[PDB]
């Protein structure tokens, strides 16, 4: 489950971090988003018929999804997403955005090449992946721990 | 930094010797696998990582992922029953880098995958092109032979 309250906190956590990066820009953020999608997808390992038991540990799957959510939030922030949009977007946590596991990669690249990345899809997909394959609370906990870590790493440099 | 048909034919035989040990081998999964290794390799370049002072993973890591991409490219070529005619005509497609520079290779790769899919020629071509343009052919072949040896030992 996900409230507008919770989503608003997520975006605030992301903004606090992104404000510490002067070179921050949407082009790189969108490329980075796509790359974390494949980092995540490579932890699920649906296609690896050469492994007896495919799939990396749950905490590893969640921490890449957390990475993907980070850039989705950042895109929505940098794009100046409005409350009006967020509130129309939450009742869409019951959509088939994550598609099915066998088509999600293909689908993802199609939407990217054709339509590009907008604030709504970039936010929606990692939340919707979490709702359908994990839990939203599992993702939020992974995400909060990761950003604290990211902050501690930025202090070093 | 040259590639002969003899060399390419040796790589294909190396790839088949490994793939014959994988009874679940199928084209659909190999194509998905190929796309994923592309992004594994792309993420070793870290060109987009403005939040890093010194972006880029070590050379051995970049080459190991480029070797993975060559592996699935060779595998796709093998499963598709690639012909001598096609290989000998493909080698003249080294030379011309054409397509991608570094700031566009991700978007270029995805465009091609979506619009054309993965064919025997393109999937084999790309990692050889990349080796020619950012590393050397020799470096990729050496990295590929080390990786496959590790792969076999892992299947043991
Ligand atoms: O502008 C940024 C940059 C990075 N980040 C965070 C998100 C994510 O947790 C992480 C992504 O950066 P990296 O790709 O460097 N980390 P990752 O763990 O994915 O390393 P790698 O790509 O090597 O697997 O940094 C932001 O939130 N905003
Ligand atoms: O059918 C196959 C399957 C795998 N392989 C080899 C190629 C490549 O070197 C490697 C790819 O399998 P993994 O993705 O499981 N290994 P990788 O190094 O990419 O690990 P990871 O995906 O976790 O980064 O196994 C084949 O040659 N044919
Ligand atoms: Mg990353
Ligand atoms: Mg990551
Ligand atoms: Mg891999
Ligand atoms: Mg790899």
Residue numbers in the entry:
A (entry chain A): 4 to 160
B (entry chain B): 3 to 158
Recite the paper's sentences.
While all the staphylococcal S. aureus phages encode Duts; some encode dimeric and others trimeric Duts, never both. Importantly, dimeric and trimeric Duts are completely unrelated both in sequence and structure, representing a nice example of convergent evolution. While the 80α and ϕ11 phage-encoded trimeric Duts were initially described as the SaPIbov1 inducers (Tormo-Más et al., 2010; 2013), the dimeric Dut from phage ϕNM1 also induces SaPIbov1. We conclude from these results that dimeric ϕO11 Dut induces the SaPI cycle using the same mechanism described for the unrelated trimeric Dut proteins.
To test this hypothesis, and since the structure of the staphylococcal phage-encoded dimeric Duts remains unsolved, the structure of the dimeric ϕO11 Dut in complex with the nonhydrolyzable dUTP analog α,β-imido-dUTP (dUPNPP) and Mg2+ was determined at 2.1 Å resolution. The crystal structure showed 2 molecules in the asymmetric unit organized as a homodimer. The structure shows that ϕO11 is an all-helix protein composed of only seven α-helices (α1, residues 7–23; α2, 29–47; α3 61–82; α4, 86–98; α5, 104–108; α6, 110–121 and α7, 127–141) per protomer. Interestingly, the ϕO11 dimeric Dut has a ‘compact’ conformation compared to counterparts in other organisms (which encompass ten or more α-helices). Nevertheless, the ϕO11 protomer presents the characteristic structural core of dimeric Duts composed of four helices (α1-α3 and α7 in ϕO11) that conforms the active centre where the nucleotide binds. In the ϕO11 dimer both active centres are oriented towards the same molecule face, forming a long channel that accommodates two molecules of dUPNPP. The rest of the protomer is placed on the opposite molecule face (residues 83–138), which corresponds to the divergent region in phage-encoded dimeric Duts but also adopts a helical fold (helices α4-α6 in ϕO11). As could be anticipated by the difference in folding between the trimeric (all-beta) and dimeric (all-alpha) proteins, none of these motifs are present in the ϕO11 Dut. In trimeric Duts, the α-phosphates acquire a gauche catalytic-competent geometry meanwhile a trans conformation is observed in the dimeric ϕO11 Dut. Furthermore, the β and γ phosphates differ in their relative disposition, chelating a single divalent metal in the trimerics, versus two in the dimerics.
